[PDB]
Design a binder for this molecule. Structure first.
Ligand SMILES: [Zn+2]
Lengths: 193, 62, 242, 840, 230, 105
């Protein structure tokens, strides 16, 4: 809100290389991040000796800290391509639920509620916008990888180790020694000098 | 689930098993499977599957 | 230095430009465009303030009138003389006049470039081009003139990075108080020509730029570095990048 | 016209006892009014009763001429060509029938017999016709023979199950249950070759609107014009701005063929040959000093002097007859010998009339189809070029390809009409014309009797082509008109399949799969495929969303033209529009007039829609505040949902502010007492919620009482909606957030996404997973399963209502069991998506 | 200045062309009518009431056809290749006389375009008559010119050829009579209202690697659940 | 452009000896005096200028989808205003139904 008051009074001045729109978005994205102390209320509610959700996360079995924060404290800002929700509903409106040129952070994907508390209808729509990207990119992680995998293999499959530990294409050197050390990648150990 | 045999219906053109459980044919060891078997150096497995089990034959060249 | 290295073309300081078929009028009796006839008022001040900047004899019947975006001149901190001097240095076959760099809103700053006869002697290899097509091309090359920064780079930030160094006692220490310039866009040769940049330690992310200027062995190290960046933290062994 | 009804003051509405569970009664009423798939039956019944008869009686008039190849007598030598002219006068479609193989009369064919025997649930089509044959002779004499043909059956048309022509429409639920039909299913599918097929809803762009897209062309502006009605023929024009500086208008239709014309030639062909007025149609004023006009004029001037190698001979021609004659040579496929007819002063007159008749009906047919609208069409064509050049200037952005403000959803009625047109011509019109050609070849024209004409018409439609109409309709229904086989995984799948919206570059392929900001309330934000190429490709209707039918466009058009606030198009000059700042008014895309105050007109007709007596409740009223345009939409294919209207006291609040100011300026120290508080509320009360559940209050009564109204995605851009009744109460006295409507939160989800309990407490991507898993769940897949022979169908014996159920279980049977589940580690056999089941 | 419609100019002009005056009055209105009806004046549509009536454009189109072709005669020397309608007229002339015809011929476009715009917006009935009377007045000026002698028979022939061509081209937009339909030469002729030879693809119509296709992924179609995001 | 006085066509521009001559396809030639000395033009930032949003700013107080702000109108003394934000510089304009416009418009 303080950034919005500076915007309304014309007190926001971008640095060289940024427009006022970009600097304002940079200020809003940085201002809407959860602090480290968000875990004080979370860890005050839980018993680490007995809480199974915390033990699965803390030991590394499953889950992360942002998963517990999302469930228990709040989801925060929805970011798509490192940006807030773009006004896509008729020139300055993000949804039919918010006015045009709305200034509040909720209008641009800031989810204030957690999953335990439940999301309102606009928060669920912004959550579905972010979650649809995961489904789209998972489908693309198969097809787009296959295109790059098949072209990489056909360009490299003729590289074969010969009796000098060199890598060549039927006679023609690609490497004077494989990996420049002549070793197998399965036979390495990290050692400090 | 599917398991077939060492024998069954084959394609008249390629001589390879028919496709899938519906045709009572075989299963595909595709292009990526041969990449993995080649990366492992398992060439006798490739002869067993791609030649002895798919459509391997004898060719005569002058 | 990062703000010094930022490509500002003359085109991006312009609100609008008008191509006028006019010659030079030392007096108030020659013909001008009606909408811009009032420009002659600050022309007389320009003559009375530039005794050695007099209009030559070979001025053509071609004028390009320019309207500067005062917000961009303020946000980018670009003076009027920096624009004028940059244009006069790069375009010797033109005559340039301008109004005052006034501080009052609603009074615009006008750039007027009169072409010279030598501008219409150059284009001979394409004999099927009239003066209108030549003058338009001159307008295009005037707009693309570099006012500040090196060509090819949009933004130049300032980043903090850590590097190692050997002390006088032989100890290797990681120094964290080092500031770099990570740019947006690649021009190894342009960054190389700058005296504020170390030329021996230019790290471009472009393989083609590295290949052209440095060679195939440096481009080999560049392919290794750029695949590593994409791979991330679970990236493969180094011998697969090799 | 002033609105009449005045409602009671909003200050006295008592809603504070409304719970969010009471607001589910509004969704109940909405679903009861629209049904779940009722639009499908309505659309097919509209096709049966109104669409096909209109198409056959109006869009299939045949008028052709064939050379006489009979040269055996003196009259045969004199006769040069024969003109075959006919049209159909009566069209009827009956209920499906079957022979029974008793050499007796036809009997009724029930859907289960069609399913078992692999038959087609198709009803007979009966047609009547009038034939006129005219033979022409060398001297210039002609002979005309007319015949009238009694009704005959041409073929059979597929019948939607549960529709008017379905036999399960005159039966009761018990009788439906006893003939092997699922007594609880609504229907909405076709039975072809023993299979069940769903003709799916198809996304199409909105007709009579300009869709401007960037691409040697720099920009493109498309415009599909339909002369009014879902079943009319459409004609698309593409206005291209090329890199060469040219502007070309290409007209694609049933007659022209992908031919690009310089834009100013279209104006010249209609008598507008002066350049200073052709430019005036685009810039609206030659005497304007605006910088937008300078950009427009500079581009238009360059485009005139660009050499088109195809239209060069008539490029400088100021004689419209020579331009019409030139284009008639290009688009007439039978003119293969130029200059052979130019010596004939009657063949040139034939070509000019043939061209003008085509041009009047094919270029912007929605603005008119006669000669008197030529200048009117040119005013509209200059408006389209004006809009396209505004995007070129980067004043305005191109069209959003994903938004539903400019999209339409077309069901079986529309889709089967387009398939019918291309099949009726191929397998009815063609055999009849060819049969008449052979009748004339093997017999003299003057010998022919009326019995010979009737016989040649009926004989030409043999079993070769009678099967063709039905089989081609079956192929269109099966091949996919985007269709899909009906998969009876469970009852939820069947309903979800009938509410599916389908569609016909890497950056474009990702963008069309995202959820768009226009979806909430119309397209379910959760339901999509979670894996594969179909992620985000099929869309689901939200629970309260419906598909609109075409309204009475003529009734509203006559009222807008009888309205003193609207100046008719033939009474305002292009100068008068721009110098007086008038606002263009459109109805279904047709520019009909101008008004001085666009906001006042839209608000006055929105109030007339609340009574519903003068303006139909299903009328879209859009006010483009960016350009001051009022758009009325009544066409088929709009998505609508009911929204509860929010009223306020902003008029009294403003007056109290004025009275406080008038007291403050007079030195009064108690000026603050004159300000009243702001109040905004909905008129929906807890008693209305109780009356809905008692069955004594419907959605139509709520609409008729001005409590709710229907909103379209294009009208939704004039709406500020409170997402729930809790948000409305939080802002009851907030004058800075004045909602136009209040939403019921569950309306943003479809039927399969509402199965998930506490779905807003789950990660939203997992709700998408459940929309898929809930449709693949075992259960009572059909209530008539013992009468069916299906493939790969599972009937789960025991099903339970969830202990925590949702509103979705009021409309679909639940599928599953209330299993006791322990959330524990037990031996490691439940890891990585594994589960331990009780063997008992 | 107060303008009025004079019908004697139309009678005078029709007398010179030896045609019925109803043909002059029906410029722009001959579409859909037999030439005999137009000649007799039968079926004449009423005066325009709308400023968007295509008849106003049609008659204004004819006026500028006359004025465009008349100025081509005035500036015949200016053309590098004078048009076909002028080359035969001034073929028998020397260069001095061909560069002439500017200072001897009258300018007959005095105040037309301004007056047509005013009348088209104000009263479309008067605009239709103004443009017909202007066309007849323009013909009479180029007819009753008597000095000098060397130009009298060369501008008078053009006034006949141009005005007849305007009326002939408008006649070509009328209803045809009887003719052989096979003169075009393709064994068939379709009318403008025929639907038998309509484009079939124009009904089922509104009017490079696939990023999501598994084309280079060699995976079985019965195993595609291995790609589920879970 | 230049419009021919007889055929009302768009005349072609040519340059000769410091003069602009308009030549039409009908043979008519004219000389421009002052208003024809504009060969070409271009304006920048077209999607953010004042003339782009004139109708929108005029209609802003009546559109019920616009953001409102709790501020007194200095003219009619209404206690709320309509706040709009245009351009990439995020220019804020407060408008009122009476006709008041911050930025003095
Ligand atoms: Zn005010």
């Amino acid at each position: 809100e303080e950034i919005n008051n500076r915007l309304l009074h014309g007190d926001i001045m971008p640095p060289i290389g940024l427009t006022t729109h970009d600097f304002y978005e940079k200020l809003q994205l940085n201002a809407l991040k959860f602090p480290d102390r968000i875990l004080k209320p979370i860890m005050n509610s839980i018993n680490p000796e007995t809480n199974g959700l915390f033990q699965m996360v803390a030991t590394g079995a499953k889950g992360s800290n942002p998963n517990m924060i999302h469930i228990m404290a709040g989801i925060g800002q929805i970011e798509i391509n490192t940006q807030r929700i773009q006004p896509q509903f008729s020139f300055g409106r993000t949804l039919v639920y918010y006015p045009r040129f709305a200034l509040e952070a909720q209008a641009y994907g800031f989810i204030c509620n957690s999953y335990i508390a439940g999301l309102t209808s606009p928060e669920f729509i912004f959550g579905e916008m972010n979650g649809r990207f995961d489904l789209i990119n998972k489908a693309l992680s198969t097809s787009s990888t296959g295109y790059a995998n098949r072209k990489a293999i056909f360009g490299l499959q003729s590289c074969i180790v010969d009796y000098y530990r060199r890598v060549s294409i039927d006679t023609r050197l690609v490497q004077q020694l494989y990996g420049e050390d002549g070793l197998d990648a399965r036979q390495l150990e990290t050692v400090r000098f | 689930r599917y398991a077939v045999a060492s024998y069954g219906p084959t394609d008249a053109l390629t001589g390879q098993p028919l496709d899938g459980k519906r045709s009572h044919g075989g299963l595909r060891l595709g292009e990526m499977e041969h990449w993995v078997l080649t990366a492992q150096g398992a060439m006798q497995t490739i002869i067993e599957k791609s030649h002895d089990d798919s459509d391997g034959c004898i060719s005569y060249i002058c | 230095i990062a703000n010094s290295i930022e490509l500002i073309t003359f085109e991006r300081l312009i609100l609008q430009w008008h191509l006028l078929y006019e010659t030079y009028s030392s007096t108030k009796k020659n013909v001008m465009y009606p909408d811009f006839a009032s420009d002659v008022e600050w022309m007389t001040d320009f003559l009375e303030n530039h005794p050695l900047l007099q209009p030559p004899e070979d001025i053509a019947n071609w004028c390009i009138r320019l309207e500067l975006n005062k917000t961009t001149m303020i946000l980018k901190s670009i003076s009027l003389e920096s624009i004028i001097n940059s244009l006069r240095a790069k375009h010797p076959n033109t005559y340039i006049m301008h109004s005052v760099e006034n501080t009052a809103s609603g009074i615009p700053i006008i750039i007027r470039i009169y072409l010279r006869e030598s501008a219409f002697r150059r284009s001979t290899n394409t004999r099927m081009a009239t003066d209108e097509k030549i003058a338009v091309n001159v307008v295009d090359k005037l707009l693309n003139s570099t006012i500040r920064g090196i060509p090819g780079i949009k933004n130049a930030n300032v980043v903090k990075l850590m590097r190692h160094r050997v002390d006088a006692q032989g100890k290797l220490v990681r120094l964290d108080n080092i500031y770099a310039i990570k740019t947006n866009g690649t021009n190894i040769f342009g960054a190389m020509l700058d005296d504020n940049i170390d030329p021996y330690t230019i790290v471009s992310s472009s393989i083609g730029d590295t290949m052209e200027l440095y060679g195939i062995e440096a481009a080999r190290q560049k392919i290794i570095s750029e695949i590593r960046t994409v791979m991330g933290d679970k990236g493969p062994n180094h011998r697969h990048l090799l | 016209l002033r609105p009449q009804i005045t409602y009671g003051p909003i200050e006295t509405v008592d809603n504070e006892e409304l719970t969010e569970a009471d607001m589910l009664s509004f969704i109940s009423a909405a679903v009861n009014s629209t049904g779940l798939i009722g639009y499908n039956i309505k659309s097919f019944d509209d096709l049966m009763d109104n669409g096909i008869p209109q198409i056959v009686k109006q869009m299939f008039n045949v008028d052709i001429t064939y050379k006489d190849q009979r040269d055996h007598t003196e009259i045969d030598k004199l006769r040069e060509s024969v003109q075959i002219q006919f049209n159909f006068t009566d069209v009827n479609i009956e209920r499906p029938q079957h022979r029974n193989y008793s050499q007796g009369n036809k009997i009724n064919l029930l859907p289960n017999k069609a399913r078992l025997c692999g038959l087609s649930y198709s009803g007979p089509v009966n047609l009547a016709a009038e034939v006129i044959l005219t033979a022409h002779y060398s001297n210039g004499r002609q002979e005309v023979k007319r015949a009238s043909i009694p009704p005959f059956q041409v073929s059979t048309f597929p019948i939607m199950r549960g529709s008017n022509r379905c036999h399960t429409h005159h039966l009761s639920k018990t009788a439906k249950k006893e003939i092997g039909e699922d007594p609880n299913e609504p229907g909405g599918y076709f039975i072809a070759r023993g299979g069940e097929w769903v003709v799916d809803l198809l996304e199409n762009i909105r007709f009579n609107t300009l869709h401007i897209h960037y691409h040697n062309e720099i920009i493109r502006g498309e415009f599909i014009s339909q002369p009014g009605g879902a079943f009319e023929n459409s004609s698309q024009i593409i206005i291209r701005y090329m890199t060469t500086g040219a502007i070309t208008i290409e007209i694609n239709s049933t007659k022209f063929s992908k031919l690009r014309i310089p834009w100013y030639l279209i104006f010249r062909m209609f008598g507008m040959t002066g350049d200073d007025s052709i430019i005036e149609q685009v810039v609206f004023d030659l005497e304007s000093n605006s910088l937008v006009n300078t950009f427009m004029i500079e581009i238009l001037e360059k485009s005139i002097h660009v050499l088109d190698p195809i239209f060069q001979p008539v490029q400088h021609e100021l004689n419209r007859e020579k331009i019409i004659q030139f284009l008639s040579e290009k688009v007439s496929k039978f003119v293969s010998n130029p200059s052979a007819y130019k010596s004939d002063e009657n063949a040139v007159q034939y070509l000019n009339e043939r061209q003008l008749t085509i041009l009047d009906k094919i270029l912007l047919p929605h603005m008119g189809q006669t000669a008197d609208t030529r200048v009117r069409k040119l005013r509209f064509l200059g408006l389209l070029i004006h809009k396209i050049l505004l995007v070129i200037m980067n004043v305005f952005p191109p069209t959003d390809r994903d938004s539903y403000r400019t999209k339409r959803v077309h069901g079986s009625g529309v889709s089967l009409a387009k398939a019918f047109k291309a099949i009726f011509n191929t397998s009815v019109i063609a055999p009849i014309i060819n049969g008449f050609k052979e009748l004339l070849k093997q017999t003299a024209f003057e010998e022919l009797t009326q019995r010979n004409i009737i016989e040649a018409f009926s004989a030409a439609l043999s079993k070769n082509t009678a099967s063709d109409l039905n089989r081609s309709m079956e192929q269109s229904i099966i091949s996919g008109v985007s269709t899909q086989s009906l998969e009876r995984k469970n009852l939820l799948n069947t309903i979800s399949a009938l509410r599916t919206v389908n569609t016909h570059q890497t950056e474009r392929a990702d963008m069309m799969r995202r959820v768009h900001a226009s979806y909430p309330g119309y397209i379910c934000v959760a339901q999509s495929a979670d894996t594969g190429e179909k992620v985000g490709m099929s869309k689901q209707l939200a629970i309260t969303a419906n598909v609109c039918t075409a309204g009475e466009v003529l009734s509203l058009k006559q009222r807008l033209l009888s309205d003193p606030a609207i100046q008719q198009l033939a009474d305002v000059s292009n100068k008068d529009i721009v110098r007086k700042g008038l606002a263009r008014v459109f109805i279904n895309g047709e520019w009909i007039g101008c008004c001085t105050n666009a906001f006042e007109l839209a608000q006055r007709y929105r109030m007339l829609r609340r009574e519903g007596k003068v303006v139909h409740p299903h009328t879209t009223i859009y006010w483009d505040s960016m350009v001051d345009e009022v758009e009325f939409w009544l066409d088929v294919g709009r998505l609508t949902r009911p929204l509860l209207i929010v009223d306020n006291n902003i008029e009294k609040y403003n007056q109290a502010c004025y009275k406080a100011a008038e007291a403050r300026k007079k030195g009064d120290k108690d000026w603050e007492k004159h300000k009243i508080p702001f109040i905004q509320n909905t008129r929906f009360t807890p008693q209305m919620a109780k009356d809905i559940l008692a069955g004594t209050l419907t959605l139509e009564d709520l609409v008729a009482q001005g409590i709710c109204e229907f909103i379209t995605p294009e009208e939704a851009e004039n709406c500020l909606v409170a997402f729930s009744i809790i948000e409305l109460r939080k802002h009851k006295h907030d004058v800075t957030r004045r909602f136009t409507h209040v939403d019921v939160p569950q309306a943003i989800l479809g039927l399969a996404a509402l199965v998930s309990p506490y779905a807003n407490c789950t990660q939203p991507a997992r709700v998408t997973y459940e929309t898929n898993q809930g449709r693949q769940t075992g259960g009572w897949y059909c209530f008539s399963w013992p009468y069916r022979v299906d493939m790969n169908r599972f009937f789960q014996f025991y099903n339970e209502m969830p202990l925590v159920k949702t509103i979705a279980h009021n409309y679909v049977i639940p599928n599953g069991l209330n299993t006791i589940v322990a959330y524990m580690i037990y031996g490691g056999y439940n890891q990585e998506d594994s589960v331990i089941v009780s063997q008992s | 200045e107060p303008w009025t419609f004079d019908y004697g100019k139309i009678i005078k002009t029709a007398k010179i062309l030896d045609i019925s005056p109803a043909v002059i009055e029906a410029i722009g209105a001959m579409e859909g009518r037999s030439y005999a009806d137009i000649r007799e004046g039968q079926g004449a549509p009423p005066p325009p009431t709308s400023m968007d009536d295509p008849r106003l454009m049609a008659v204004d189109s004819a006026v500028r056809i006359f004025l465009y072709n008349y100025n081509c005669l005035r500036h015949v020397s200016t053309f590098n290749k004078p048009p076909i309608h002028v080359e035969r007229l001034v073929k028998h002339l020397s260069y001095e006389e061909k560069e002439d015809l500017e200072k001897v011929l009258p300018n007959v476009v005095n105040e037309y375009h301004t007056t047509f715009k005013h009348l088209r917006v104000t009263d479309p009935a008067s605009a239709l008559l103004y443009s017909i009377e202007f066309l007849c007045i323009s013909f009479l000026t180029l007819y009753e010119i008597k000095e000098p002698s060397w130009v009298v028979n060369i501008v008078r022939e053009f006034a006949l050829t141009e005005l007849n061509t305007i009326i002939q081209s408008e006649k070509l937009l009328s209803k045809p009579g009887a003719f052989n339909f096979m003169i075009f030469g393709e064994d068939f002729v379709c009318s403008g209202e025929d639907s038998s030879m309509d484009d079939i693809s124009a009904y089922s119509s509104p009017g490079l690697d696939d990023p999501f296709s598994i084309e280079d992924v060699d995976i079985s179609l019965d195993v595609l659940d291995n790609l589920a995001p879970q | 452009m230049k419009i021919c006085k007889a055929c009302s066509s768009c005349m072609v521009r040519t340059y000769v000896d410091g003069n602009i001559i308009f030549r039409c396809s009908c043979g008519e030639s004219v000389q421009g005096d002052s208003q024809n000395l504009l060969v070409s033009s271009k304006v920048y930032h077209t999607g953010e200028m004042e003339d782009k949003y004139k109708i929108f700013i005029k209609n802003a107080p009546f559109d019920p989808t616009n953001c409102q702000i709790k501020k007194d109108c200095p003219n009619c003394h209404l206690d709320y205003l309509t706040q709009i934000c245009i351009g990439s510089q995020k220019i804020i304009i407060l408008v009122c139904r009476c006709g008041y416009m911050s930025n003095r418009g």
